[PDB]
Symmetry: C4
Subunit: 80 residues, 4 copies
């Protein structure tokens, strides 16, 4: 990643690994080590992601928001 | 939220997302991104919440307390 | 507690809540909010506890050790 | 360990305890408190490890990488 990986990884139902970085992104990494997608927030993603029953990925950011990200890497919503 | 979301979200049995904020609050957010409730502690909620078998939400605060919050957002107890 | 509760709580099989504090202790709190026991390490317990299959509670400390604590609050071992 | 254990332990299917240290290593500790192996990254391992379905251990490092480590302590891959 572009900065410290302070965030703790979460593992999806299909093995996808999700983790934040101080480079401001939430990363979705395939089990083979190849990027699935990254999603840019406005600040360090120190928070560790959680995965909902429908696969939504939730994570906080130092930009003050809680993010809900769809499994395909598109924003679902953010809460300030 | 009002400050960095350092805390890592927890997901309840009904999909509710709980997370602390450096704005001093524990947040309960519905899966649709709308606030269910927030609970104010005396300092940053860096700690990440855990959910008990009866749904109680437990989280630490930089105000020195461990909080137990009922699912409706009312204080159950705090331990110094 | 005596200092910031940075650590994230873990919940045991019987509902006991375990959490570290920057006051250097690992706390075991009953679901009713009353202390079961506390265990003193040599520095802040920022690490969040994990519970093994036999109930052992594991947590790191800023004193450089990983601690294994028995369910009764007595040290099992520490690893430097 | 050689430095603060900020990381939060993860427990494997066989009881192995995995945790990072600010000494830059990911540690695998047997339930008896004896080292199984340690793996050196390039910076503090503040991130808390997660365990995949095949036992792979994933953890971030302040060296900017997400690491995937095999259960025997050998690198599987790292993602920058
Ligand atoms: Co750096
Ligand atoms: Co930045
Ligand atoms: Co801010
Ligand atoms: Co404040
Ligand atoms: Co204080
Ligand atoms: Co101290
Ligand atoms: Co030290
Ligand atoms: Co260093």
């Amino acid at each position: 990643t572009g900065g410290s990986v302070h965030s703790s990884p979460a593992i999806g139902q299909d093995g996808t690994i999700y983790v934040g970085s101080n480079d401001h992104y939430l990363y979705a990494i395939n089990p083979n080590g190849k990027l699935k997608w990254k999603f840019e927030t406005g600040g360090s993603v120190h928070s560790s992601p959680a995965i909902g029953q429908d696969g939504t990925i939730y994570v906080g950011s130092n930009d003050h928001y809680l993010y809900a990200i769809n499994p395909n890497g598109k924003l679902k919503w953010k809460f300030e």
